[PDB]
């Protein structure tokens, strides 16, 4: 069972092809499972103070990878914790901040397999000495009026399971189309279809229903699980519920269509 994400109501006549369009781009799945769980945390600084100054990509780090400092000069100057992914801390350290280092830094984490990303901005204003060095909040970020000529630390720590390597059951995208018929309860609804990112497909009901009740052929290649119900019978009414699950990422989406069928007179 999947928690409520989208609920909808549909109405159609018997003998017509219904389309209960369930889709989730986050259910898109990569055929390559070679350490697909790669995480890249990188720091991007834009020096808005120096007019229109090209932003500098100071440092990259990859879970199961090195902390490559982009420019040879910044080596040593830019530092990120080596256990960053292990503990979730992705803060930066500038060993000796100077006027050249001033600007809005931005840490960005990217998860390839889930095709997910996050990021937060932190400003670094360089003041000559300690008489004007402090920290404050501008409204969307933390700003550090840093001590020129001394180490300054720009904080960001993402305390979430998505950015940690603890075992996650290596789950993959799965989908369950059920149909709570009139008088039936949800989560007991007779299963209509079952799909997995590996292409596993299961159909339910009489073969004619399976022919009429069918999900697209390349569901997970598109993140689509639209359910076609050809030549609707009035018994094909009820609450159709598509439960989309990806336990490795935490996806627990529910997409529901209350398809009530009608007949002529």
């Amino acid at each position: 069972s999947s928690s409520l994400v989208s609920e909808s109501v549909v109405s159609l006549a018997a003998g017509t092809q219904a389309v209960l369009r369930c889709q989730s781009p986050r259910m898109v799945w990569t055929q390559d499972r070679l350490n697909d769980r790669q995480r890249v945390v990188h720091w991007d600084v834009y020096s808005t103070y120096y007019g229109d100054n090209k932003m500098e990509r100071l440092c990259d780090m990859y879970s199961a990878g090195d902390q490559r400092v982009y420019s040879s000069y910044n080596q040593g100057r830019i530092f990120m914790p080596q256990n960053a992914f292990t503990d979730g801390n992705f803060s930066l350290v500038i060993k000796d901040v100077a006027e050249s280092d001033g600007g809005i830094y931005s840490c960005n984490l990217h998860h390839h397999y889930c095709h997910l990303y996050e990021t937060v901005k932190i400003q670094l204003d360089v003041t000559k000495k300690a008489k004007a060095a402090k920290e404050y909040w501008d409204g969307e970020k933390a700003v550090i009026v840093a001590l020129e000529g001394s180490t300054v630390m720009l904080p960001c720590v993402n305390r979430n399971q998505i950015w940690t390597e603890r075992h996650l059951e290596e789950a993959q995208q799965v989908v369950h189309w059920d149909r709570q018929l009139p008088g039936v309860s949800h989560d007991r609804a007779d299963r209509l279809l079952d799909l997995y990112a590996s292409g596993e497909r299961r159909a339910y009901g009489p073969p004619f229903l399976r022919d009429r009740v069918s999900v697209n052929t390349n569901a997970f290649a598109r993140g689509d699980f639209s359910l076609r119900i050809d030549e609707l019978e009035r018994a094909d009414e009820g609450i159709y519920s598509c439960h989309l699950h990806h336990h490795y990422c935490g996806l627990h989406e529910r997409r529901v269509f209350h398809l009530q069928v009608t007949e002529p007179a």
Binding site: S72, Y73, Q75, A98, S100
Partner: protein, 48 residues
């Protein structure tokens, strides 16, 4: 009166895809230096 023909050959194992050892020939070492210069309480970078 029968006879049997036997043949054998070799190929790299699948795991080689990550266990490969590659031989290299190197020459004409080149060196790059990152300099930081300070003058008149102003800091400048370079890498040459």
């Amino acid at each position: 009166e029968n006879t049997q023909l036997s043949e054998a050959y070799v190929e790299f194992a699948p795991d080689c895809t990550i266990d490969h050892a590659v031989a290299l020939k190197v020459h004409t070492a080149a060196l790059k230096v990152g300099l930081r210069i300070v003058y008149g309480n102003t800091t400048a970078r370079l890498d040459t």
